[PDB]
Amino acid sequence: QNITEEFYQSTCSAVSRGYFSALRTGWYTSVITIELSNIKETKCNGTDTKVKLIKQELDKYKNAVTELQLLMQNTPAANNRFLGFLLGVGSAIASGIAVCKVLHLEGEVNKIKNALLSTNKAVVSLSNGVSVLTFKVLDLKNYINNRLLPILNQQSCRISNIETVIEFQQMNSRLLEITREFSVNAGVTTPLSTYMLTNSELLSLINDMPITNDQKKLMSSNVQIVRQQSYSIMCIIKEEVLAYVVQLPIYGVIDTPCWKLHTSPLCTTNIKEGSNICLTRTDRGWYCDNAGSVSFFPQADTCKVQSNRVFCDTMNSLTLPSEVSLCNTDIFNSKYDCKIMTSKTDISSSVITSLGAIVSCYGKTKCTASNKNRGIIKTFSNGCDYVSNKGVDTVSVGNTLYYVNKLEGKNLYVKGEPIINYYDPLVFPSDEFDASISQVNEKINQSLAFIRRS
Amino acid sequence: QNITEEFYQSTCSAVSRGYFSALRTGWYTSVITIELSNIKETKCNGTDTKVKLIKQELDKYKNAVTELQLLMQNTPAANNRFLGFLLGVGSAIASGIAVCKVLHLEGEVNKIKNALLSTNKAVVSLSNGVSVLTFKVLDLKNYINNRLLPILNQQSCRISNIETVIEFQQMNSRLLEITREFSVNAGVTTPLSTYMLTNSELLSLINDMPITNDQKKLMSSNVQIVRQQSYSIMCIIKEEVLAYVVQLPIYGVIDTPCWKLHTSPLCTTNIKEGSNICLTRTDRGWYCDNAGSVSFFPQADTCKVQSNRVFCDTMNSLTLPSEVSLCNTDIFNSKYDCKIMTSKTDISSSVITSLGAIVSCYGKTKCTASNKNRGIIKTFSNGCDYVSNKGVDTVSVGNTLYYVNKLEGKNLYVKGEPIINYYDPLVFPSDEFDASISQVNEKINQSLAFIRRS
Amino acid sequence: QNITEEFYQSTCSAVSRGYFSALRTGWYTSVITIELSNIKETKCNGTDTKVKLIKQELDKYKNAVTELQLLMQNTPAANNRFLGFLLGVGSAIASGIAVCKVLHLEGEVNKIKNALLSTNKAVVSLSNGVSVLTFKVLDLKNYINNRLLPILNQQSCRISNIETVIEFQQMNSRLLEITREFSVNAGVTTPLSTYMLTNSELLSLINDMPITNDQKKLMSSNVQIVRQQSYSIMCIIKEEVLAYVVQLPIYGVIDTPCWKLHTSPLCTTNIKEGSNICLTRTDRGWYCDNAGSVSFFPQADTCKVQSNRVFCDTMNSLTLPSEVSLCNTDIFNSKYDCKIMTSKTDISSSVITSLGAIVSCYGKTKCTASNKNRGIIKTFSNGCDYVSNKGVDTVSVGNTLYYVNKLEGKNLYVKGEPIINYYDPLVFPSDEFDASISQVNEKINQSLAFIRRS
Ligand SMILES: *[C@@H]1O[C@H](CO)[C@@H](O)[C@H](O)[C@H]1NC(C)=O
Ligand SMILES: *[C@@H]1O[C@H](CO)[C@@H](O)[C@H](O)[C@H]1NC(C)=O
Ligand SMILES: *[C@@H]1O[C@H](CO)[C@@H](O)[C@H](O)[C@H]1NC(C)=O
């Protein structure tokens, strides 16, 4: 957890480095099953409370099976996924859906049923060429047919004991909650709950997945994050089996360097009303080296940071050439056309970084950094400035209070003239929402083609 | 499920056709009731476990009623709802809220109470002129007053049986979960859960709704989607009645043609850095014919597709003239000013379509389509291109893998010169976020007014 | 609830006034504890159902503790937060996280354990200088060790009674649900559920908070809204204690004037295709006076309105000078550069306001306001227009139906020439996504510098 952060005064941006990747590139699919009983009506006509109680619970079981059948008519299941508007589009659950489709082919559910006759965990080779870990997590068929129905049948049906009511409730419990979870999510859930897959089942699954021991260690040390990036997909009710697919991430990029880019608006600071111009670097977000290029995540919130490990889904990334990082040290470089937006919107704001805070202070806004016991320790002047988190608790910009992160690291302030000062405001192309350094230079040049004749 | 898709090479867009609409235009409101008991304290002072267990459960009932009362002080309930930023604004639950308001008028709850004295389902004519289907789904008044309180009262209060504890838990159960659901959603829930309305209640409701048998068949064949587009709204606790309103969709547009427009960026492909220009059709999303015009849904994710049926809420649409579809076959037509955005952002990306994939490949990005067993079957060259899903499993653009849909349909590739090539890059108005063909032509012409004197 | 609304025909905007603020400026943190038992294995080897039932429930307890331990390895917990893209960035849960960190220091959990030995509620002075209200809401240590384990131990372990199974289920219940809630939210939940903190605990907490009696009255009269703006943060499992932090809002701005600005597009109405220009005021949202300036909430949906009280979080605001409100009465004023976007997008739409509706009607769109019993009572002509909610039930724009709010107030229609008519369309800078009155004037002037030589 050796984090280093550099602030660039010239471009009102800061880069936090020292992070290591865990990027999801693949999917592991597993089939989870519950064995069901094919009983729709019992010939018990008693009146006492125990009788009604078993009937109520059997009604709950039967209405769960029916709800799961109505989830099946809304199948295929549905799910999908500053510069976020450019992201590509595809379904996040295509892999799971392909496995569900295979489970509909004659014999396939029966093959899984036979693999789990004598064990609750087995690898099965499906017809489409995937080997999947399959589980039987609950056997309501044996419980209803062999432990409950003999009580209700071979004797007067009122002769049960209140313990069997309570046991049947406990056996039905996990089925009703899986059904509930699927019913309010249209058969596709994320994060993966402990009712879809318990911790012991999930850790067992990870341990038997066709991945390296390092990947197994990563996933087992970060179970919650694995759950947040996993899906459960309702598949089929068929031949007295309920089957659903769990889709777990495979982190095909691990331990490459990652860095987070924070950006804020950089405006001129004249007092005259509406006389100021602005630019903001629009390439903020997470960056991870990946296979000769760089995976860029423009909605930074899509990545989950655990200490110095950054977990992201590659479906939330744009693939950029590695020269994009030159924008941090030389925004005018000729190898990559660095992205900016221009405006005359000089509204104050702050960004809390990994190890400090950037503050864009304009007009009359009060912008300060404080220590809870000592008072104000820094006051920001008009323009874009930075403070490390050392000795600081909070940053106030106008009426809003922000808390800095408490992590201790290394901070570097790179001094430089704000680049907004290099532009002639009479010819600056303001109000460009998605622009770049070259486009702006090109426009300035063109509109200095009139001033030529002068 | 006869889907047809056409790709237009000239404009980097594809249209999937063969879909049929189901658009929500109206709302059906129903009042769901639970009968409650007005008991706040029992004079039972025993010490054994059964006693405490009944007291705990009565405390749960009483705290549910209190939580429902605090939901009532946060009433009226609150809910609402590329070109999505233009959508109009209004409340999705105004109809339900109007019914809740009527339930507060003297006598109204009593009228419903009297309609349900002898039946659990009845149509009631409210004072505001709406006839609503009303339900009594749980009678905790009769259970507490007539089956539970005689046990706790007319005898020593320790003489209960553990069955009555379990029965009281089961009777209280649905009340506690409805209360829980409302409590973490500020009294307004969507999707409609099976605790708000069970499958049998919902199917009963649909069957008695004042709609045609075709609408009843649609809704009954697509219960999950109906639930996703329905609301439950907490209304009142009054005169020993809990009442909430369920608001179900009415699909007033059915079986008209719908088509989905996919678009991707179309840039020039010079090697020179920052020398390329781009345009993207901004009118992507779902389109359905509707009442002489066309309902356009710019956040395509707002529509739920079930096979070839497309379910959408008209509140998520813009109403356009039917000439908008000319943009697909003739983007330069003079009847509708086709919408585009311009830029110099030549970042690679892909869109998975209904029957294939569009790929915008720029710079050095590796863009390919593969079959899992055969390897790469297509490589995309710089520019905008398309592949059908026939014989294809996946599309890779840089570091991101996408899965194509597996549905088989008809695919047409319409060859044509990319229209970005028609523009002189020295005068192209780049970086226009919300533009159109005419605005761009108008700007080019103006800025060719200087080159005149030359 | 004296609301007044003014519509400005000149700028296609309306301002609803008469509201009073409740802005969250601070956070109150409280530590909630559950006492746990350190038992992982019982030497009971029986076979009957009661035995298994206790073992199942003990397994549930133990798997809850383990799940809470895996939530701890994904700690620090994670949470954060038209002109919304300008908002600053920081963590909403920094205060709670600082308290969690302190609970990890030697002796700190023990200090809380000793403060709650004889009471379930006490104020405790933590090592970092915060006094926190701490609660013990469940004592599973005493229940397992002193009421359950003697039954399973000092006698044959099959001698329990089914009541103790049911009592143990009821005692374990709240622990399992808190664990479930944390497990699918990565240890950070909002809204604050009744399992994290019951109504009686929450009202007790408010009553003992170091705030004024007016703040206590506000919070106690609006519990649901307090819950929606609160967080629960999983902290630690240590020394047989589960501890989590609840973070409640402190409304440091109360009863200052608030007003809501509604805006819609204002376009010219020529029949000629693609010949029209448009502008829209981009400063729509909620505004509250606050400390000499004005807190502006651009994603209006971030504020919760209860009658005439407006509850917002200052982290969702931009701090503006109070001259921003001049844009409502004089959009050309020289004290504040009023914000607009320009385009040629003349697509029809509506905004339902507090007391009426704005309608932007263009092209051939049918735009009307109706009364359910009387029919159409107003038809909107091309351009931007307004109707109050008096005698109106609904507004239709094309294919979409909107319901007006039913609240009765005062409505003022300020007549004035649409300002879009003042611009020469040949020189209007269209397609500016984030602009202002001055930038537009400046551009018009420059591009009238060519027409000079003429
Ligand atoms: C931490 O990492 C930075 C960057 O690699 C390096 O400069 C520094 O020497 C490292 N220090 C320690 C103590 O690991
Ligand atoms: C499918 O629909 C398309 C478009 O209407 C039509 O061209 C084609 O003939 C149809 N084919 C079948 C087999 O239905
Ligand atoms: C309501 O408030 C408005 C604005 O302050 C004021 O003009 C009016 O006189 C008030 N009327 C009543 C009845 O409170």
GROMACS .gro file of C-alpha atoms in nm, chain A residues 156-413:
model
  258
  156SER     CA    1  -5.431  -4.046   0.996
  157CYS     CA    2  -5.306  -3.722   0.853
  158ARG     CA    3  -5.337  -3.533   1.186
  159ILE     CA    4  -5.067  -3.743   1.361
  160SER     CA    5  -4.775  -3.517   1.280
  161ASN     CA    6  -4.554  -3.348   1.541
  162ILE     CA    7  -4.494  -2.971   1.550
  163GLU     CA    8  -4.124  -3.043   1.492
  164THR     CA    9  -4.195  -3.163   1.138
  165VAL     CA   10  -4.379  -2.838   1.065
  166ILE     CA   11  -4.073  -2.644   1.180
  167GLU     CA   12  -3.838  -2.876   0.992
  168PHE     CA   13  -4.040  -2.838   0.670
  169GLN     CA   14  -4.033  -2.459   0.712
  170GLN     CA   15  -3.653  -2.474   0.746
  171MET     CA   16  -3.616  -2.697   0.439
  172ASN     CA   17  -3.846  -2.477   0.228
  173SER     CA   18  -3.677  -2.158   0.348
  174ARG     CA   19  -3.386  -2.139   0.102
  175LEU     CA   20  -3.615  -2.220  -0.195
  176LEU     CA   21  -3.859  -1.938  -0.103
  177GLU     CA   22  -3.582  -1.678  -0.071
  178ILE     CA   23  -3.407  -1.772  -0.396
  179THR     CA   24  -3.750  -1.746  -0.559
  180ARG     CA   25  -3.820  -1.408  -0.395
  181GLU     CA   26  -3.476  -1.273  -0.506
  182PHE     CA   27  -3.531  -1.387  -0.862
  183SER     CA   28  -3.892  -1.258  -0.867
  184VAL     CA   29  -3.805  -0.889  -0.804
  185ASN     CA   30  -3.500  -0.895  -1.039
  186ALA     CA   31  -3.659  -1.065  -1.345
  187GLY     CA   32  -3.458  -1.385  -1.293
  188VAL     CA   33  -3.111  -1.220  -1.293
  189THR     CA   34  -2.945  -1.109  -0.968
  190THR     CA   35  -2.623  -0.930  -0.882
  191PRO     CA   36  -2.453  -0.919  -0.631
  192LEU     CA   37  -2.455  -1.293  -0.572
  193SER     CA   38  -2.634  -1.343  -0.240
  194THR     CA   39  -2.561  -1.608   0.024
  195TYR     CA   40  -2.897  -1.771  -0.059
  196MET     CA   41  -2.793  -1.814  -0.423
  197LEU     CA   42  -2.457  -1.949  -0.309
  198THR     CA   43  -2.338  -1.982   0.050
  199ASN     CA   44  -1.986  -1.889   0.157
  200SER     CA   45  -1.883  -2.252   0.196
  201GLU     CA   46  -2.029  -2.339  -0.148
  202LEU     CA   47  -1.859  -2.039  -0.306
  203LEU     CA   48  -1.523  -2.111  -0.149
  204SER     CA   49  -1.557  -2.477  -0.252
  205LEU     CA   50  -1.639  -2.363  -0.607
  206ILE     CA   51  -1.336  -2.130  -0.626
  207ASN     CA   52  -1.111  -2.410  -0.499
  208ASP     CA   53  -1.223  -2.642  -0.782
  209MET     CA   54  -1.232  -2.384  -1.061
  210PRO     CA   55  -0.991  -2.439  -1.362
  211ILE     CA   56  -0.775  -2.142  -1.263
  212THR     CA   57  -0.432  -2.101  -1.102
  213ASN     CA   58  -0.364  -2.113  -0.729
  214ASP     CA   59  -0.287  -1.738  -0.741
  215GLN     CA   60  -0.628  -1.660  -0.892
  216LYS     CA   61  -0.788  -1.894  -0.632
  217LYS     CA   62  -0.605  -1.701  -0.355
  218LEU     CA   63  -0.715  -1.365  -0.492
  219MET     CA   64  -1.078  -1.469  -0.520
  220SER     CA   65  -1.080  -1.638  -0.177
  221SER     CA   66  -0.924  -1.333  -0.012
  222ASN     CA   67  -1.183  -1.099  -0.171
  223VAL     CA   68  -1.514  -1.289  -0.156
  224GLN     CA   69  -1.739  -0.984  -0.126
  225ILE     CA   70  -1.590  -0.827  -0.439
  226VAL     CA   71  -1.628  -1.157  -0.626
  227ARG     CA   72  -1.996  -1.155  -0.517
  228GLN     CA   73  -2.045  -0.796  -0.640
  229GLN     CA   74  -1.910  -0.894  -0.985
  230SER     CA   75  -2.105  -1.225  -1.011
  231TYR     CA   76  -2.452  -1.307  -1.138
  232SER     CA   77  -2.718  -1.562  -1.063
  233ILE     CA   78  -2.944  -1.651  -1.359
  234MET     CA   79  -3.268  -1.849  -1.326
  235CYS     CA   80  -3.262  -2.125  -1.587
  236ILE     CA   81  -3.513  -2.410  -1.570
  237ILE     CA   82  -3.771  -2.604  -1.372
  238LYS     CA   83  -3.777  -2.952  -1.535
  239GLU     CA   84  -3.789  -3.324  -1.438
  240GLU     CA   85  -3.827  -3.236  -1.068
  241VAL     CA   86  -3.514  -3.019  -1.074
  242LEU     CA   87  -3.476  -2.646  -1.030
  243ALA     CA   88  -3.155  -2.527  -1.197
  244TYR     CA   89  -2.997  -2.185  -1.202
  245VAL     CA   90  -2.659  -2.069  -1.325
  246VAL     CA   91  -2.404  -1.872  -1.125
  247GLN     CA   92  -2.154  -1.671  -1.335
  248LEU     CA   93  -1.833  -1.586  -1.154
  249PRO     CA   94  -1.557  -1.349  -1.273
  250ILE     CA   95  -1.228  -1.468  -1.406
  251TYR     CA   96  -0.954  -1.209  -1.352
  252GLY     CA   97  -0.741  -1.254  -1.659
  253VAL     CA   98  -0.534  -0.941  -1.590
  254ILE     CA   99  -0.369  -0.933  -1.250
  255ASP     CA  100  -0.095  -0.721  -1.089
  256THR     CA  101  -0.037  -0.482  -1.374
  257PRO     CA  102   0.013  -0.112  -1.285
  258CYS     CA  103  -0.304   0.096  -1.237
  259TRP     CA  104  -0.335   0.473  -1.178
  260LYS     CA  105  -0.627   0.706  -1.113
  261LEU     CA  106  -0.659   1.041  -1.288
  262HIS     CA  107  -0.851   1.319  -1.112
  263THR     CA  108  -0.933   1.636  -1.304
  264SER     CA  109  -1.106   1.966  -1.221
  265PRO     CA  110  -1.183   2.285  -1.415
  266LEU     CA  111  -0.905   2.525  -1.501
  267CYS     CA  112  -1.033   2.878  -1.566
  268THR     CA  113  -0.884   3.223  -1.593
  269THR     CA  114  -0.946   3.446  -1.294
  270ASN     CA  115  -1.039   3.796  -1.420
  271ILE     CA  116  -1.290   3.986  -1.203
  272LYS     CA  117  -1.492   4.106  -1.503
  273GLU     CA  118  -1.826   3.928  -1.538
  274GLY     CA  119  -1.843   3.659  -1.801
  275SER     CA  120  -1.489   3.737  -1.918
  276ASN     CA  121  -1.326   3.406  -1.812
  277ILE     CA  122  -1.241   3.096  -2.014
  278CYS     CA  123  -1.205   2.739  -1.896
  279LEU     CA  124  -1.080   2.396  -1.990
  280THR     CA  125  -1.107   2.063  -1.810
  281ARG     CA  126  -0.925   1.742  -1.888
  282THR     CA  127  -1.205   1.499  -1.974
  283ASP     CA  128  -0.998   1.178  -1.942
  284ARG     CA  129  -1.048   1.132  -1.567
  285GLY     CA  130  -1.095   0.781  -1.437
  286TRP     CA  131  -0.899   0.461  -1.371
  287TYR     CA  132  -0.623   0.335  -1.604
  288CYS     CA  133  -0.460  -0.010  -1.596
  289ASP     CA  134  -0.188  -0.140  -1.823
  290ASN     CA  135  -0.335  -0.430  -2.016
  291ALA     CA  136  -0.186  -0.636  -2.296
  292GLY     CA  137   0.030  -0.368  -2.460
  293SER     CA  138  -0.242  -0.101  -2.432
  294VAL     CA  139  -0.429   0.065  -2.151
  295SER     CA  140  -0.778  -0.019  -2.021
  296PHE     CA  141  -0.947   0.313  -1.933
  297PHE     CA  142  -1.250   0.318  -1.705
  298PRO     CA  143  -1.423   0.659  -1.747
  299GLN     CA  144  -1.691   0.601  -1.479
  300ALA     CA  145  -1.424   0.547  -1.202
  301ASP     CA  146  -1.706   0.422  -0.968
  302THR     CA  147  -1.712   0.110  -1.179
  303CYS     CA  148  -1.385  -0.011  -1.018
  304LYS     CA  149  -1.373  -0.142  -0.655
  305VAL     CA  150  -1.049  -0.057  -0.470
  306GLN     CA  151  -0.932  -0.288  -0.188
  307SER     CA  152  -0.617  -0.134  -0.036
  308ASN     CA  153  -0.384  -0.112  -0.341
  309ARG     CA  154  -0.581  -0.368  -0.553
  310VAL     CA  155  -0.824  -0.231  -0.819
  311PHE     CA  156  -1.099  -0.465  -0.935
  312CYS     CA  157  -1.275  -0.370  -1.262
  313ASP     CA  158  -1.484  -0.525  -1.539
  314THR     CA  159  -1.328  -0.483  -1.887
  315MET     CA  160  -1.680  -0.430  -2.030
  316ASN     CA  161  -1.670  -0.089  -1.855
  317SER     CA  162  -1.347   0.015  -2.031
  318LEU     CA  163  -1.221   0.182  -2.350
  319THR     CA  164  -0.899   0.043  -2.490
  320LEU     CA  165  -0.646   0.319  -2.548
  321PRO     CA  166  -0.284   0.330  -2.670
  322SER     CA  167  -0.032   0.354  -2.390
  323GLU     CA  168   0.069   0.705  -2.510
  324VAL     CA  169  -0.250   0.837  -2.340
  325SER     CA  170  -0.048   0.866  -2.018
  326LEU     CA  171   0.176   1.132  -2.181
  327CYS     CA  172  -0.116   1.373  -2.125
  328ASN     CA  173  -0.025   1.371  -1.758
  329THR     CA  174   0.333   1.493  -1.805
  330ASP     CA  175   0.307   1.679  -2.138
  331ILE     CA  176  -0.045   1.775  -2.241
  332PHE     CA  177   0.088   1.933  -2.562
  333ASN     CA  178   0.276   1.614  -2.678
  334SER     CA  179   0.246   1.515  -3.045
  335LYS     CA  180   0.194   1.136  -2.980
  336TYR     CA  181  -0.157   1.146  -2.831
  337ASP     CA  182  -0.426   1.418  -2.882
  338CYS     CA  183  -0.514   1.488  -2.519
  339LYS     CA  184  -0.885   1.529  -2.445
  340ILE     CA  185  -1.035   1.845  -2.291
  341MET     CA  186  -1.366   2.028  -2.274
  342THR     CA  187  -1.381   2.408  -2.295
  343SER     CA  188  -1.635   2.649  -2.145
  344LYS     CA  189  -1.694   2.975  -1.964
  345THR     CA  190  -1.837   2.789  -1.662
  346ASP     CA  191  -1.618   2.902  -1.375
  347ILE     CA  192  -1.821   2.736  -1.094
  348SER     CA  193  -1.617   2.630  -0.794
  349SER     CA  194  -1.570   2.265  -0.698
  350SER     CA  195  -1.347   2.003  -0.540
  351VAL     CA  196  -1.232   1.648  -0.604
  352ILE     CA  197  -1.104   1.437  -0.315
  353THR     CA  198  -0.814   1.233  -0.449
  354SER     CA  199  -0.640   0.925  -0.306
  355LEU     CA  200  -0.394   1.131  -0.101
  356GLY     CA  201  -0.531   1.487  -0.108
  357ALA     CA  202  -0.775   1.715  -0.280
  358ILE     CA  203  -0.790   1.935  -0.586
  359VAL     CA  204  -0.981   2.260  -0.547
  360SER     CA  205  -1.106   2.477  -0.834
  361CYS     CA  206  -1.192   2.810  -0.664
  362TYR     CA  207  -1.359   3.089  -0.866
  363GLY     CA  208  -1.537   3.415  -0.806
  364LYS     CA  209  -1.617   3.485  -0.441
  365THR     CA  210  -1.629   3.123  -0.324
  366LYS     CA  211  -1.470   3.044   0.014
  367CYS     CA  212  -1.237   2.746  -0.035
  368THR     CA  213  -1.038   2.611   0.262
  369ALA     CA  214  -0.877   2.301   0.413
  370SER     CA  215  -0.907   2.240   0.788
  371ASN     CA  216  -0.788   2.026   1.076
  372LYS     CA  217  -1.064   1.953   1.325
  373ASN     CA  218  -0.862   2.069   1.617
  374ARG     CA  219  -0.648   2.345   1.467
  375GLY     CA  220  -0.877   2.535   1.231
  376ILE     CA  221  -0.802   2.650   0.877
  377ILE     CA  222  -0.456   2.536   0.763
  378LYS     CA  223  -0.488   2.630   0.397
  379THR     CA  224  -0.690   2.881   0.197
  380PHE     CA  225  -0.723   2.831  -0.179
  381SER     CA  226  -0.677   3.129  -0.405
  382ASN     CA  227  -0.869   3.180  -0.729
  383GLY     CA  228  -0.770   2.911  -0.972
  384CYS     CA  229  -0.686   2.546  -0.942
  385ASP     CA  230  -0.483   2.429  -0.648
  386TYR     CA  231  -0.407   2.114  -0.440
  387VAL     CA  232  -0.353   2.005  -0.080
  388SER     CA  233  -0.221   1.672   0.047
  389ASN     CA  234  -0.408   1.493   0.322
  390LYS     CA  235  -0.119   1.543   0.568
  391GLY     CA  236  -0.250   1.725   0.875
  392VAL     CA  237  -0.585   1.786   0.697
  393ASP     CA  238  -0.927   1.646   0.789
  394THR     CA  239  -1.164   1.838   0.564
  395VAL     CA  240  -1.199   2.066   0.260
  396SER     CA  241  -1.482   2.322   0.233
  397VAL     CA  242  -1.584   2.475  -0.102
  398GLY     CA  243  -1.864   2.716  -0.051
  399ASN     CA  244  -2.137   2.548   0.140
  400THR     CA  245  -2.013   2.188   0.100
  401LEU     CA  246  -1.779   2.001   0.333
  402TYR     CA  247  -1.564   1.714   0.203
  403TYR     CA  248  -1.351   1.470   0.402
  404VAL     CA  249  -1.005   1.379   0.273
  405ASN     CA  250  -0.891   1.015   0.274
  406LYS     CA  251  -0.674   0.932   0.574
  407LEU     CA  252  -0.421   0.705   0.395
  408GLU     CA  253  -0.061   0.825   0.422
  409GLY     CA  254   0.145   0.825   0.105
  410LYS     CA  255   0.387   1.034  -0.099
  411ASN     CA  256   0.267   1.363  -0.255
  412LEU     CA  257   0.439   1.566  -0.531
  413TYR     CA  258   0.320   1.914  -0.637
   0.00000   0.00000   0.00000
